[PDB]
Amino acid sequence: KRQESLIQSMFMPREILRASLSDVDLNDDGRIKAIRFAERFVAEYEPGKKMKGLYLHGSFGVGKTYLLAAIANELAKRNVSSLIVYVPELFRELKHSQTMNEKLDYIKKVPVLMLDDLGAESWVRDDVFGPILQYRMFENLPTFFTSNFDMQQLAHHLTYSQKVKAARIMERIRYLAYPIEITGPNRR
């Protein structure tokens, strides 16, 4: 349907938004636990409710991003808007840029936010990414993520120094989402 019309998207092709939580197979634990969580989230969702999102991590091509698109489609089926952001592209358009701040605002404020592909390529990110996360915590705005790295690795990954604050941001994330590993074949 016009489901896709309610699903906003930044820096990523809209054709990947052709997804459904019914096309995902039961094959293993990762997804069984994931969509089970997803559907409970989508059923119980209501503006302004402490609610944990998902932090999906795993190898390349297991269907992590598709899971987010899938969840967004379920929500648009509830007439709730969400936004999926290819994050690596968000941090880049931020270095080379007319307008962008009006959009960070939209990101911090959307009902449900899905940050795709966290973790690939101190730092100014202490001013941009953290605040976003902190605003969604403060306002009870559900937040999802997809990374190739898990909680342990992601920290070790963003901008290594010779600090702790990277670990402070790692805290907002696990506060915001419940991590689940997605195993399975390499769909490609």
Ligand X SMILES: Nc1ncnc2c1ncn2[C@@H]1O[C@H](COP(=O)(O)OP(=O)(O)O)[C@@H](O)[C@H]1O
Task: Report how far residue 152's alpha carbon sits from residue 147's, in angstroms, rounded to the nearest whole number.
Answer: 12
Q: Which of 9, 35, 53, 63 binds ligand X (CB under 6 A)?
A: 63
Task: Report how far residue 23's alpha carbon sits from residue 91's, in angstroms, rounded to the nearest whole number.
Answer: 31
Residues 53-112, interacting with a copy of itself (CB under 8 A)? 60-61, 86, 88-89, 92-93, 96-97
- Candidates 20-28, 30-38, 71-79, 133-141: pick the segment binding a copy of itself (CB under 8 A): 133-141
Total of chain residues touching Mg ion, rule CB under 5 A = 2
Q: 187 by DSSP, 3-state: which?
A: coil
The breaks in the chain (C to N more than 2.5 Å) occur after 97, 121, 162
* Contact between 152 and a copy of itself per CB under 8 A: no
Total of chain residues touching a copy of itself, rule CB under 8 A = 31
Burial class (CB in 10 A: 0-12, 13-18, 19+), 104: middle
Q: Are 103 and 31 in contact (CB under 8 A)?
A: no
63 interface partner picked from ligand X, a copy of itself, Mg ion, none, CB below 5 to 8 A per type: ligand X
Buried b (16+ CB within 10 A) or exposed e, 152-181: eebbeebeeeeeeebeebbebbeebbebbb
Q: Which of 8, 19, 30, 65 binds Mg ion (CB under 5 A)?
A: 65
| 165 has binding-site annotation | no
24 interface partner picked from a copy of itself, Mg ion, ligand X, none, CB below 5 to 8 A per type: ligand X
Interacting residue ranges for ligand X, rule: CB under 6 A: 23-24, 48, 60-66, 187
Q: Which residues bind Mg ion (CB under 5 A)?
A: 64-65
Interacting residues toward a copy of itself by CB under 8 A: 11-13, 46-50, 60-61, 86, 88-89, 92-93, 96-97, 120-121, 134-135, 137-138, 140, 164, 167-168, 171, 175, 186, 188
